[PDB]
Design a protein around this ligand. Structure first.
Ligand code: SF4
Ligand code: SF4
Ligand code: FES
Ligand SMILES: [K+]
Lengths: 230, 55
């Protein structure tokens, strides 16, 4: 056995080598908040929400990418961890548009939920927000790039799962836009699943748009009959 | 406070008190129906520095 010992909030647990801090905390039972991390996509680490503190160390580490070693104690509820989370989400919400009432993601938005959970209660931003030019990628996915937070799940999904390699980031700095750089339709077998893995309301479902709200819909678990995959 | 003095005197004698000092019907002494617009103040958490929610 190659299992090594780590500590989450003082609680000992066994992990495999190469395990990230996020997976060890999940094995203990703590869900570290995340935006760009996905269990089925490659690790990107460009949102800095998962910054957790290792004790006896003068820096916060990215739990979605840091591999654990022996003797580590992970503090998921300390003071500087919460300070880092609040600062990161204040930066995230600094340029976010006030589009919540006219958003299809409202009520099932990850940004709203962790803003209520780990975020602050007021905004100190007294400047002007940015406005990204919209794009068209087909009659299935409605695109509003003013709401995108540049999490790069688009690029990783279109490069590692769909295998299209037609989505990317053009720009450098605060004006970097996630798009296609040309009038190209993102037509694929799995072109709708980006709507599933967009944490904000930047990519919505065009047939579903402006129809219902997530809190008033009953969910029934069923089986697809459209093909033989089941 | 519109009745003649005879009625006020008979009323004060029958009641045993003085009713003209304290009338139960409101008059021009009440506040005006229109008011200047207010400016409600802010609370103790409306600050730009040292306002961490975790504390
Ligand atoms: S994506 Fe979320 S935070 Fe942004 S406007 Fe929509 S509901 Fe609001
Ligand atoms: S549109 Fe959504 S999924 Fe795509 S990069 Fe932006 S936030 Fe991420
Ligand atoms: S979830 Fe780790 S940096 Fe985004
Ligand atoms: K979405």
């Amino acid at each position: 056995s190659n299992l090594i010992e780590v500590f989450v909030d003082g609680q000992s647990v066994m992990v495999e080598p190469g395990t990230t801090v996020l997976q060890a905390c999940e094995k203990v039972g703590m869900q570290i908040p995340r935006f760009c991390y996905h269990e089925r996509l490659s690790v990107a680490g460009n949102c800095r929400m998962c910054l957790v503190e290792i004790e006896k160390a003068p820096k916060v580490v990215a739990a979605c990418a840091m591999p654990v070693m022996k003797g580590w104690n992970i503090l998921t509820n300390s003071e500087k961890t919460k300070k880092a989370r609040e600062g990161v989400m204040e930066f995230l919400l600094a340029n976010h548009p006030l589009d919540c009432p006219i958003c299809d993601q409202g009520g099932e938005c990850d940004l709203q939920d962790q803003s209520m959970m780990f975020g602050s209660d007021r905004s100190r931003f007294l400047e002007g927000k940015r406005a990204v030019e919209d794009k068209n990628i087909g009659p299935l996915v409605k695109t509003i790039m003013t709401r995108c937070i540049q999490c790069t799940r688009c690029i990783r999904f279109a490069s590692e799962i769909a295998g299209v390699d037609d989505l990317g980031t053009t720009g450098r700095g605060n004006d970097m836009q996630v798009g296609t750089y040309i009038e190209k339709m993102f037509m694929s077998e799995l072109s709708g699943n980006i709507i599933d893995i967009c944490p904000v309301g930047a990519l919505t479902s065009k047939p579903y748009a402006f129809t219902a709200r997530p809190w008033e819909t009953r969910k029934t678990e069923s089986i697809d009959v459209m093909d033989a995959v089941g | 406070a519109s009745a003649t003095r005879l009625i006020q005197g008979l009323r004060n004698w029958a009641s045993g008190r003085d009713l003209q000092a304290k009338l139960q019907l409101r008059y021009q002494e009440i506040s005006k129906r229109t008011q200047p617009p207010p400016k409600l103040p802010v609370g103790p958490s409306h600050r730009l520095s040292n306002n961490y929610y975790c504390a």
